[PDB]
Design a protein around this ligand. Structure first.
Ligand SMILES: Cc1ncc(C[n+]2csc(CCOP(=O)(O)OP(=O)(O)O)c2C)c(N)n1
Ligand SMILES: Cc1ncc(C[n+]2csc(CCOP(=O)(O)OP(=O)(O)O)c2C)c(N)n1
Ligand SMILES: [Mg+2]
Ligand SMILES: [Mg+2]
Lengths: 821, 818
């Protein structure tokens, strides 16, 4: 009863207004924050010249934040705040400022007049703090700039964290996005026996930037139908008199009380009785809060513009409240009277002392210590942020040696790199039963994670109908049963930022559905690295498999390897892209990836049976150094001059480049060349701008592999050719002869997909012989006879593939053999 | 059309189409083996069967019932397959009604043409597995799932007589884009637009999983769709093999759906209903058609057993792709294939010569009523470009006196607002064939003039004055916060013959990176089909660019779209970076006249200096590049000490100011300035379909001089794109200045210093290269460089102390060179 009395709710109301007062003031003022309490009227010099920030969403989110604090203290609940409308950065900064966590992160921002003035001036100021809930914000793991991912992130955050609740505010405009709409299905994968809970609040403030919202103009009856159809239990916070603030507080206290209690009851039944393990979906609460936009701020634009019913255009309860609600500035003080009236309406003299500190009677409202949402270790790298316990990856390595390199192992499944990787992943689940997860979009089986299903199932909460279904269970370390890349990526990001490690595998082309989500995750960890008070994070591991050259049953629309270019443009110090050519290298790169911190790890991996090349010693070197000269594939020994260099990155390119130099060496053993296998592609760059040099090769190391400028380089690449061309310009190295994907392909045979882009051995061999002849390193008779033979083979390729639907033995039957000399 | 006799005719037609769709997975010859009395041998079978089976029979069921509707109601309609991986479900229906032969005369409706089609399916040099542009009647390949309803909506916008028969996969229904595309009916006005007839193909499974909606109860499914404003009707049965029961029930449901759609359209067009906030109760059909319907039931030949039977194929995910291991190298399961294929009773469906039985030939529509012949599906009923006004009528009066200066009216210095004058007039000249799309950003992006001629289309209740510029009828669609919707609508609007534009914040346009990929692949593949008509171009605008974020920060900074689209076949991509308003006007005059392109325009919305006359603007938009004499001390193809070049508004401003600083102290330096608008012309990529607009080596040297000529290049996007271009051209000496992934909430000109794009860093590089090239003396260079450094020293101090920029930036105006 003590957390439900009107005396207590009036204290909450004051704390609420205290937070909203500061959030509003820092939009316009850079000093003199308590002008009406300290008896110092506003002067032009106190005002910002170009006020920046958002107002509309703020007061509604601080209302919800205040009520979240009440729940924490009343129920002793571990909880954290996630702001869907992240553009209202004040809704997280000042609540942290009021409970002392902000000062703990920023000692100079003290809880007095000096520190308050310092905070006002830093807000949305050059070199200060942003307007959004960036990593500068204590308690944030979600910036909310690019809208739509707050619920998928919240789900990943509460997976395997049974004691945590995610207090997730969803903007009603945000609710119109694709990712947000489908993220409501997340409760079909949350098992209350082992996982925490998300408490979603739909912030139905009625408007977005310039429009009303589709859900706000949906009736409460239809809103109920929508959420009940998805398995939720909707409860409503609304009132006919929007300024009877105490009426909202009483109702919010009732609704939120039953929301937590129903969540706890759901968790009790699942953990003590074993409920919800038979296909029953818990009736998870969802709170629909109709809190008018710009709540408690300017009501009408009376100072300019047209009139309606003797008043200016409405600001409160309209889109016009979204950003800066007044034209006030140091250059335009016309609306200063309106600002003073607005700011004093909060009664700041009842909220703050003259010395800037919060009134004594309000200091016990917020939680203390780690119970504060801004201090919850979930929001600062996770309660436990340690890396995985890894087994020795060599226990799952292929037995490659000098005598079977470049050949197919007897068990076809061992020639499938993804399947070999699943062996390693399967053991990791055994060693990390609660802190490792695999995510996919209905592709884990198609991507050949076959060993994973020997140790776990896909987590699936709805009814199960074996044998029509397979490898699904209410408890599972894999989450794969929703067809949405946004979901898989959002879950992984939330899981990763909260201290755990996982992997998200997808068809290569369709991982680009999530191009912008990866951008945002890079942005976050890059900014988080600049915060000395923040712990680092585990790395985000995304796998591009079923790649351009391995989409047999799916044609041209499943071919886009451009993710390599997209991520190569970010700061390299936070990006690690790996193109292992075989299973042993793939195992070795993930041993490294799983130990790296605050990275995005992008691995391009093969799933179809392919020749295996490198010993587990060679694989270790390739994964550690990321690049290497392969002596058994080279005719030029250490420190020798070369006529050209062969290099490749990727499984298919490596097979074809190795085959090309073999074909050349068969007729011309005198040609001197090195073969260089490229795994860590970022090592080759030399970009302008800082935070790109951590792994870039020195000029000496680069020349050791590719020789001096002018050295021809036959470079087989998995992705688009522009990325390699930019690299060799950055390195000032003329002579690159790139062979990558050229946006050509369709339904065809395995090796014709390589001929489509002229990546194949025969087109590469021609270019190699042509440059040798052009450089007068070989006589014309031999050059012409060889090139004619390569051309004859390609003619046969086109006849057999179009007439028979199979590849020629020149491709299919080839195995590696020692070079001549 | 409801008699048992007619429905048995429909059932035979259905089994005939499904028989061929299944057979072409495995056979390349002898397609009617049981009718011609020629049992299957290994040489008749494909070596590596390719394709999908699970989804087809359900889609051919729906296609057949769609044909019934067309004939019964005389309805103009077209098919859209969400699960596009079952391409035969659109190929074979087209083959049976003659439209396929009209497109491919060699694929005749006889035994020979039938064998030819079997061999072409999913074969090297044949046709694909999906509903590609090779498929007559398709405007939606369905490879990347999730956009069938957004495309369907755009297709029926401004086409009141058309119905989009759009089938939604139940796995596809789990994606973000589809889930939110259900909101489209909040923007369809039955008074002026067509109708979508969506069918949720609840076959129960996707690749390897059951589906979330299939395991949702019919009661909850009803709650879901009624909450979204639809009227759900169900097709299901307890006995999944009582095919005539499904036919009867499907006929009732589909009849009632068409009639309810027509009643909605009549009430809207005759009585004026649904103009006051009432959303029509649009029908949505929930069809529980088992996956692998009518095919193999259990994997009796291998694998584990359950209840004395093999693992289920029908009514399971195992039917998704190739349901048998049969092949020319593995004939073990030929009996299962023969039993499966003969179960359709092909002897009752096809004649021995391969032709379709006579009693079945009258089932499908004829002529343009066939969904495969509907002009909607081949470039649109009307595919003409917009009628355009002379863009010069909205140009700024730029001349030698006011170049490089702010016009007195601040709104004329904002290119997007100037563009909105042009778009507003286009609305008046094309009231039913031009539309503007945005994701709650049209006003934010400063299309202010558009709102004086039209409103946003919005079907729910309106509450003025709290609302603004929304109406049940409007040429703008902007009131849904979803890039997937805006892009999907535009794509459907475009492929069906109309033209529009989609404007978005630059960094958030990348939400639909993959959608633009799919549209490019489509128009490129459509170009390879000689029977296919052209398309209008897809116009997308990237605004609020990286160097124009005031109220937003680092998360709104990503100009990587330029690189993404530059990697596709450049013959279908046009990227323009106009530096001022007059160029932007001229670019869209050209963009709106191009065919089968993606036009990506990077444009400024904040007030900036204006540079080019309407004569220069025309030349920049036509040639895409030009040497600017008044910013040059040397001519084209003439010797120079270095070259200045830029692409974009902010980069052009700083590069122009940089060369001005050099010439100000050292007018002896000989250089030309080159403004770059059509960036793709500078490329020289390997691979075909990239050469149409590429500069010749002679043209490239005319602008940038020979290899070794230093080139100070200011660029809007990431630097690697320029570096790749100059490697393709073998041109040593590039000194690129682009976005370098550095930025934050800061001042206008500091966003440029963050990446060292500013004039002062550019001037330093320019003087440094002259010194290394021994065309200047050390004393002059260091005094200049030290001065440049000193100016940068102050820049860092003022902005961090006051929150405003220094007069060295804000007060600079263009003046004549020496
Ligand atoms: C995917 C995406 N597109 C566009 C934007 C630009 N944007 C920022 S805020 C906003 C309006 C958000 O409305 P709402 O979610 O209702 O927040 P609130 O009403 O609390 O301000 C938009 C469209 C964005 N953030 N994300
Ligand atoms: C965005 C996206 N992610 C993944 C895929 C890969 N994929 C192809 S088919 C398929 C299953 C689709 O199932 P459903 O929608 O139920 O169609 P059905 O075959 O059952 O008719 C998937 C996941 C895809 N095409 N698009
Ligand atoms: Mg809102
Ligand atoms: Mg399905």
């Amino acid at each position: 009863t003590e957390y439900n009395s009107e005396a207590y709710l009036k204290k909450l109301d004051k704390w609420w207004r205290a937070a909203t007062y500061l959030g509003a003031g820092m939009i316009f003022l850079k000093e003199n924050p308590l002008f009406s309490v300290t008896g110092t009227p506003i002067k032009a010099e106190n005002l910002k010249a170009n006020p920046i920030g958002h107002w509309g969403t703020v007061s509604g989110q601080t209302f919800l934040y205040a009520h979240a604090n009440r729940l924490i203290n009343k129920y002793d609940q571990k909880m954290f705040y996630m702001g869907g409308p992240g553009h209202g950065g004040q809704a997280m900064v000042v609540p942290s400022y009021l409970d002392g966590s902000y000062t703990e992160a920023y000692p100079e921002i003290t809880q007095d007049l000096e520190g308050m003035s310092r905070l006002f001036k830093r807000f949305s100021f050059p070199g200060g703090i942003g307007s959004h809930m960036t990593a500068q914000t204590p308690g944030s793991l979600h910036e909310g700039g690019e809208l739509g991912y707050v619920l998928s992130h919240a789900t990943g955050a509460i997976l395997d964290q049974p004691e945590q609740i995610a207090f997730a505010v969803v903007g009603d405009g945000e609710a119109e996005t694709g990712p947000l709409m489908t993220s409501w299905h997340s409760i079909k994968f949350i098992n209350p026996k082992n996982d925490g809970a998300i408490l979603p609040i739909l912030d139905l403030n009625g408007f977005k930037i310039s429009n009303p919202t589709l859900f706000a103009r949906t009736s409460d009856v239809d809103i109920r139908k929508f959420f009940e159809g998805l398995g939720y239990s909707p409860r409503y916070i609304e009132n006919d008199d929007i300024h009877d603030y105490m009426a909202y507080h009483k109702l919010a206290a009732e609704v939120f009380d039953k929301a937590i209690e129903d969540i706890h009851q759901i968790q009790k039944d699942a953990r003590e009785d074993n409920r919800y393990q038979n296909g029953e979906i818990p009736a998870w609460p969802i709170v629909i809060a109709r809190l008018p936009k710009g709540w408690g701020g300017p009501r009408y634009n009376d100072w300019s513009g047209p009139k309606f019913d003797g008043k200016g255009m409405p600001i409160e309860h309209s889109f016009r409240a979204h950003q800066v609600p007044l034209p006030l500035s140091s250059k335009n003080m016309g609306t200063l009277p309106e600002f003073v009236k607005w700011m004093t309406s909060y009664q700041p003299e009842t909220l703050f002392n003259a010395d800037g500190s919060l009134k004594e009677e309000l200091r016990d409202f917020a939680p203390k210590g780690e119970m504060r949402m801004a201090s919850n270790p979930v929001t600062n790298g996770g309660v436990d942020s340690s890396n995985l316990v890894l087994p020795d990856w060599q226990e799952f390595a292929n037995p490659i040696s000098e005598n079977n390199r470049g050949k197919l192992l007897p068990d076809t499944n061992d020639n499938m790199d993804m399947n070999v990787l699943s062996k390693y992943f399967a053991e990791i689940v055994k060693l990390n039963p609660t802190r490792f997860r695999l995510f996919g979009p209905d592709e884990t089986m198609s991507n050949r994670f076959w060993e994973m299903f020997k140790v776990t199932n896909r987590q699936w909460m709805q009814v199960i109908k074996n044998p029509n279904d397979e490898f699904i269970s209410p408890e599972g370390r894999i989450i794969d049963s929703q067809l949405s890349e946004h979901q898989a990526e959002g879950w992984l990001e939330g899981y990763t930022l909260t201290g755990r490690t996982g992997a998200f595998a997808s068809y290569e082309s369709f991982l680009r559905v999530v191009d912008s989500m990866l951008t945002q995750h890079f942005k976050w960890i890059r900014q988080a690295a600049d915060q000395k008070w923040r712990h680092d994070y585990p790395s985000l591991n995304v796998i591009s498999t079923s790649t351009v050259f391995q989409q047999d049953h799916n044609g041209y629309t499943h071919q886009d390897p451009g993710m390599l270019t997209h991520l190569a443009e970010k700061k390299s110090d936070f990006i690690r892209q790996y193109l292992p050519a075989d299973g042993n290298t793939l195992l070795a790169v993930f041993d490294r990836a799983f130990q790296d911190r605050s990275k995005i790890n992008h691995i391009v991996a093969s799933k179809q049976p392919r020749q295996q090349w490198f010993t587990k010693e060679e694989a270790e070197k390739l994964a550690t150094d990321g690049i290497a000269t392969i002596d058994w594939a080279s005719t030029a020994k250490d420190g020798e001059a070369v006529d050209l260099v062969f290099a490749s990155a990727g499984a298919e390119p490596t097979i074809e480049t190795l085959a090309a130099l073999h074909l050349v060496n068969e007729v011309f053993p005198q040609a001197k060349f090195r073969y260089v296998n490229v795994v860590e592609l970022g090592r080759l760059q030399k970009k302008k701008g800082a935070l790109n040099q951590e792994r870039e090769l020195s000029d000496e190391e680069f020349e050791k592999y590719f020789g001096p400028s002018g050295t021809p380089v036959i470079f087989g690449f998995h992705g688009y050719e522009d990325l390699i061309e930019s690299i060799f310009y950055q390195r000032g190295h003329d002579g690159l002869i790139v062979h990558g994907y050229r946006e050509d392909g369709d339904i065809t045979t395995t090796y014709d997909m390589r001929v489509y882009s002229e990546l194949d051995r025969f087109h590469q061999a021609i270019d190699a012989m042509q440059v040798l002849y052009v450089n007068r390193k070989v006589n014309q008779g031999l050059a012409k006879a060889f090139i004619d033979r390569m051309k004859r083979t390609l003619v046969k390729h086109f006849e057999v593939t179009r007439n028979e639907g199979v590849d020629i033995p020149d491709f299919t039957e080839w195995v590696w053999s020692d070079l001549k000399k």
